[PDB]
Every structure is written in structure tokens, then in C-alpha cells.
Amino acid sequence: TYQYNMNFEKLGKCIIINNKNFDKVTGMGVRNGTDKDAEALFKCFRSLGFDVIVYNDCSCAKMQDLLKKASEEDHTNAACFACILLSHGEENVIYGKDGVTPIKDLTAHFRGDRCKTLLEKPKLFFIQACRPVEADFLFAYSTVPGYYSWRSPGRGSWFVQALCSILEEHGKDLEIMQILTRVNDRVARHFEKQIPCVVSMLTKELYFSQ
Amino acid sequence: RDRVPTYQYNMNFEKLGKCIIINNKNFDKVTGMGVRNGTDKDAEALFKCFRSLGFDVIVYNDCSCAKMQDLLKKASEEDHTNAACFACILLSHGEENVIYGKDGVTPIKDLTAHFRGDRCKTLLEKPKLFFIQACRPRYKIPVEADFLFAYSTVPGYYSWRSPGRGSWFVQALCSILEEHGKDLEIMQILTRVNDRVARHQIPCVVSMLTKELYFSQ
């Protein structure tokens, strides 16, 4: 009653945009580690039951088309939708490899109206980007685009590490907010700066199980 | 599903915390803002509600911008050492990143900054809750841990402060808190409020909290 009905054929689709090499004409160097993060995320989410697909070095066109096309799909037997973005970011904007595109435009497509099939179902956006308020949307930022998010060349971001670890072990028993909160604490505890940020328009508790 | 974890905010303190409610109903003509009929009804339900949770609630009304800033700053300079948390509720007119005082408009972000870890070390590691009902996204928020923002309406749209029933968000918040304030976790309460408000406009919660928040046991 107080939970999102997960009784569906599929858990849902999980698009993982992984931008690592940005065209010079943007002024943003390679994101060594995003490859580590991504693989981690791929497993973690595939493990939750998502039909996950990874897209590398996407342009603002590719990224917009991707999200556009996905929203257009039929999500009837889908429990929800998940999108994970990994790249450079600024004021509410995400970096393509050839420029910058506004996050709002990526989520726009899945709004209640533009995507009848996902209506009433959770839309999840996990955004990791160092430098659209509609119901049932949830955003989880590695940290605001302005403040820097700590990585580790061959170890990946703390956020992603924490998120995959927590999800790996509790992705089945904790509610989505509990997990993200632990991710919050864990990322936070690293410094002892950066604190992830969760924005939730969810109307029911979210559980990737039963 | 819910149980015994070091994943809960330590609530074992002398007192629960202070709860500041700013009830701006009347605004200076020059601001062009109208009377917020129904705000007193929210203010009353809110004060009773939080008083009931164990908060030491203080209610200010028709405050000026200078007043709001001063009040919150002073609140941040007090010694919250024996308090478990801190709550501030703003009921007024709103606009992108700003909230109205009677004499004008001031940035929500500055109002909340007063409590950042480095400026209110006595609330450090302690949840700082802001419930904002600014009629009329992470941006108008401090980059600090243990902060929680529950925005009344769409930080892009307008909430419907009912003529003489009280804003939908507020009333829903109080309703759910009366009922489960002492048995549900903060995100559970607000998520239900979200649903409730939506079953009528969608409120949004920004959480930087690092632990679960239970007001009791």
C-alpha cells in the first residue's frame, strides 16, 4: 500500500551513460576510473535485476536520443526505470563528449505525461558529475556538480564504490532511501568536502524485491 | 521492515531540539505579494504537531528579511549540545532560490547556511531539518551533511495553500506526523506526505542525512 508494486515481468531498463573521453573542444580531460565505476555499476544493477545497457562517450545528441528513445519504449511489464550518468557536470548540466546538455532535458521525456507506461512507477537517476519535479522521480547525485567529487584513478569514485557496495549487500532488503542514506554516510565518512545529494519525489517506499 | 541499527541518528539527548516556525502572512504592499490566508492554520497545526514530537517550538510571524536572517543566525549561535536535532519551518511566499520576508525577498540558501557544520559546530553530525512552504532541485541548499529539505511545492511550480483549510503540504505533513511521527522514519513520513499531497502538485525532499531519523525510542 505504502510501497511501489514490484510485481512485474521485468524490474526495468537501466541506461548507463559512461562518458570518459570528451572532445578537446570542450576543455574536459579523460575521466580515468569511470571505466572502473561503470563496470561496477553494470554488475551491481544487473544484479538487482535491471536490463542494463552501457553507452560510452555519448554526445549531447546521443544522450538525448538515448533517453528520448527509451522513454518511447513500452514499459508495461516494467517495474521502473533507471538511468545512470557518469561524466563532467556543472549547474544542472551534464557533459556530452562534444559539449553540454541540461539534465532537465534528459529526464523531461520520462515525465508523467510524456511516458504513460512509466506513470505511477519510479524513475531513478543516479548522477555522478563533478565539474523536472514530477512525481515518482528520484535523483541521487555523487555530489552537486559545483563541489568536487573524489575519485581514485584506478579505484573509481567513492560514491559509486559506496553505492555498489551497499546495493551489493542490501539492495534486496533495504528501502531505496535507506541505501542512499548509507551511501551518504559512507561517502561522508571518507574525508574523516563532499556529500552526495538525494532528491526524491517518490510517493511510495521503493524495494528491489518481491 | 525496520530495526535496531547504528544506522540511526542518536536521539538520546537532554532535549529533542528547537523548532523555529516563521509564519509570514502579511507582506508590505511594495512587494506586490498578497495576504497568505490559511497560513495561520498551518502555523497552528505545525506548532502543536512539533510541540507534540518533543520539540521546543518558537513561532515568529510576519517577519522582515532582516528578522529572518538574524533569528536563524542567532539560533545557529546557540548551544545545541543537549539537543538531538534542529527544525525550521518557513511559511511564506517563494520564488527561485528565494523566500519572502514582509519587506522583501531573501535567499533560502543563506538562511540555511547559518547551520553549516563550520558555523554551528554544536549541531554537527546532528540532523538539521528545514520544511519549507514557499507558495508562489538542490541549488538553494548548503553542501553540508545532515541536512534535509522538504519543499512544499514544486521548486518550479506553485503549491495550493487552501483558502481556509491550510496548504495541502503542511496539513498532510501534520496529519502524517500526528499519526506516525513517533514510529516512522523521516523519509517514510515525507514520502507518504508526497503521496498524500499528490493524491489531491508534488513536494520534493532533498536529503543529505547520513543516518535514519526516528523522533522516538
Strand, helix or coil for residue B208: coil
Breaks in chain B after residues, C-to-N cutoff 2.5 Å:
136, 200
Q: Please tell me the experimental approach by which this structure was elucidated.
A: X-ray
With the C-alpha atoms ordered A207, B2, B8, B14, is the resulting torsion angle positive or negative? Answer: positive
Q: HSE-up of B25 (CA within 13 Å, CB side)?
A: 17
- Search chain A and give the residue with CA nearest B140: A144
| Chain-chain contact of B210 with A135 (C-beta, under 8 angstroms) | no
A190 noted as active-site residue: no
Residues 6+ apart with CB under 8 A from B63: B22, B24, B71, B101, B102
- Search chain B and give the residue with CA nearest A2: B192
Q: Cα A79 to chain center, whole Å?
A: 16
Q: How far is A160 from chain B (nearest CA, A)?
A: 16
- Residues spanned by the domain of A76: 1-210
Partner residues linked to B91 by β-bridges: B23, B133
Partner residues linked to B133 by β-bridges: B91
d(CA A177, CA A184): 10
Count of domains observed in chain B: 1
> A144 to chain B: which residues are within 8 Å by CB?
138, 143
Per-position b or e across B114-143, b if 16+ CB within 10 A of its CB:
bbbbeebeebbebbbbbbbbbbbbbebbbb
d(CA B58, CA B183): 24
| Chain-chain contact of B209 with A181 (C-beta, under 8 angstroms) | yes
Pair B1, B71: CB distance under 8 Å: no
Q: How far is A201 from chain B (nearest CA, A)?
A: 5
The grid coordinates listed for A76 are: 508495461
Query: Angle B87-B57-B181 (CA atoms, 0-180°, nearest 5)?
Result: 65
Return the DSSP state at A209: -
User: CA torsion, points A127, B198, B135, B53, in degrees to nearest 10?
Assistant: -90
Which phi and psi (to 5°) does residue A76 adopt?
-55, -50
Amino acid code (one letter) for B129: L
Residues 6+ apart with CB under 8 A from A31: A19, A20, A86, A87, A88, A151
Strand, helix or coil for residue A128: strand
Q: How many CB pairs under 8 A join A and B?
A: 100
| Chain-chain contact of B206 with A199 (C-beta, under 8 angstroms) | yes
Q: Which of A14, A83, A115, A130 is catalytic?
A: A130
Query: What's the CATH code of the domain at A52?
Result: 3.40.50.1460
Query: Angle A90-A194-A172 (CA atoms, 0-180°, nearest 5)?
Result: 100
| Chain-chain contact of A2 with B156 (C-beta, under 8 angstroms) | no
Strand, helix or coil for residue A88: strand
Burial of residue A50 (CB within 10 Å: 0-12, 13-18, 19+) is: buried
The shortest CB-CB distance from B209 to any of A146, A174, A184 is to A184
B200 noted as active-site residue: no
B contact set with A (CB within 8 A): 1, 7, 137-139, 141, 143-145, 154-157, 187-188, 190-192, 194-195, 198, 202-212
